[PDB]
Every structure is written in C-alpha cells, then in structure tokens.
C-alpha cells in the first residue's frame, strides 16, 4: 500500500527546525530502498518529492545489569516536497 | 523458587465471597474477598489492615505519610462460611443454571 513502511517521525530539533523550511524527516525501515520510501510517503500525505536522502543508524545502550546492551538499528530518511509546502499539519507540530 | 504450587493455583474461593481468617492473627475475623491471586496464594479481604508509608519522591507535591491498606494472606483463611464457623464444602448439584455447580457443608448454600 503506502501507509506501511514508514516507522515514525524524526522528532529532534534540527528536524523540526528543518520542517519550518518544508523539509520533513522521519524514520523509515532499514530495508526500504530510497524509491519505495519516496513512493509511500507521497501517497500517505498526498504530495510529491523533489529530493530524498537517507542513511542507516546503530544503537547499543543500557543503564546497568551485566546485560551490556545491543544496537537497535534505524534508518532516518529525509524528504523534500515540491514548493507546495507543508504536510497535513503533523508539521507545525 | 517453587511458589504457590504446593497447593495448585486454585483458590478455594472467589474474590467476592466472605471468609473467616482461621489460624494466624485475625482468627475468625471475616470480610469480603477483594483480590484472589491464585498463583501466589494471595487473598485480599477487608479483614487485616496495615498503615503503609507511600514512597512518593518527586511525586507531584509529595505530602506522603502513611496510608491504611489491606495486606494479603494465603490459605490462612478458610473460604466461605455459613454456620458462621469455618466449613469444608461438598454437596453440589446445579441450579436453573445447570450450566453450573454449587457447593455446601453440613448445610447447603453459598
């Protein structure tokens, strides 16, 4: 479909202060070739994309417990729609 | 760590019945069941009480003192009673809800 794949929105501030310029970024799935993803998004928020950019990310933490940690691996993705700025409102957040 | 299995995660009663705390302190005291923890053999009956101090740190304006709460017990209370005294259970059957079975002692209710 479309609504699938995306995993969640990238909160952070840069992302947010990146939104004020119509650049929305969220966490897609690790395996999710730059195209599928380009697609999905379009059809979930109704809008095209002039540019895309994505890269993978590891995790490995803990607080304590001789249970070290373990990565958790994500894939932040950053898009850019056509001058027709904004997406829903889940932007002005 | 074994745990409440010696019996058989089977509470010889319901979390609503009334019961007499035979044995231990609060002997004969009675009250309505409230929590029936079968696995652990825990029973919360309005009977026994405690005054605990809530560890409420930065808990939005602490003011934590000492609550009055009920502290659970085991098979130290004999489920249900009708002769006003503890009582086993044995003579069942069914009701207009043959879709069920009752229980009873010398007498026959519950």
């Amino acid at each position: 479909s479309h609504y699938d794949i995306l995993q969640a929105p990238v909160i952070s501030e840069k992302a947010y202060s990146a939104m004020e310029r119509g650049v929305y970024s969220f966490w897609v799935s690790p395996k999710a070739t730059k195209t599928e993803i380009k697609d999905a998004i379009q059809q979930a928020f109704g809008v095209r994309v002039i540019g895309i950019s994505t890269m993978n990310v590891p995790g490995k933490r803990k607080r304590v417990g001789r249970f070290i940690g373990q990565r958790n691996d994500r894939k932040k993705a950053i898009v850019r729609l056509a001058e027709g700025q904004s997406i829903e409102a889940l932007a002005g957040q | 760590p074994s745990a409440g299995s010696h019996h058989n995660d089977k509470l010889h009663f319901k979390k609503g019945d009334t019961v007499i705390v035979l044995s231990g302190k609060h002997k004969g005291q009675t009250g309505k069941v409230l929590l029936a923890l079968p696995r652990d053999q825990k029973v919360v009956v309005e009977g026994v009480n405690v005054i605990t101090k809530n560890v409420k740190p930065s808990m939005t304006n602490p003011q934590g003192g000492q609550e009055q709460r009920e502290l659970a017990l085991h098979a130290s209370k004999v489920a249900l009673v009708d002769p006003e005294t503890g009582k086993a259970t044995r003579v069942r059957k069914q009701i207009v809800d043959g879709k069920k079975v009752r229980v009873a002692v010398a007498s026959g209710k519950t």
């Binding site: 479909s1 609504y3 995306l6 995993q7 969640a8 929105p9 909160i11 979930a44 957040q93 | -």
Partner: protein, 66 residues
C-alpha cells in the same frame, strides 16, 4: 471483529478493513513517538484485528476449492 459479520463482506473490503487500520496504526505509532499515545491498547487491538482480517480471508482460500 470475527463473527459471520466479518467474513460477511467482500474480499476487497477485507483489504479495506486492512489497509485502513494500518493507516490508523500508523498515526497511532506516530503519536506515541510524538508523545500522547493514551490508547496503548488501541494499538494491540487494531493490530489484533488485522490478524483476524487475514486468518479469515485465508480460511476462505480453502473453502470453495479444497
């Protein structure tokens, strides 16, 4: 949800009854991360539904052809 009022529908509707939940299941999943997910259960439910929304559909795949 599950009774003969689940299968009751069109195969396509099954999809509709699918591709629409996972559309909620997303906005939810977002909320969470954005903080405000006050329906923790909704998630699990909506999810559980999709399960059924297929198990059934799948039960057909053998009844009416063997």
């Amino acid at each position: 949800m599950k009774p003969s009022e689940m299968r009751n529908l069109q195969a396509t509707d099954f999809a509709k009854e699918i591709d629409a939940r996972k559309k909620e299941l997303m906005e939810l999943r977002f909320q969470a991360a954005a903080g405000q997910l006050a329906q923790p259960h909704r998630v699990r439910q909506l999810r559980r539904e999709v399960a059924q929304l297929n198990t059934v559909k799948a039960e057909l795949a053998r009844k009416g052809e063997q």
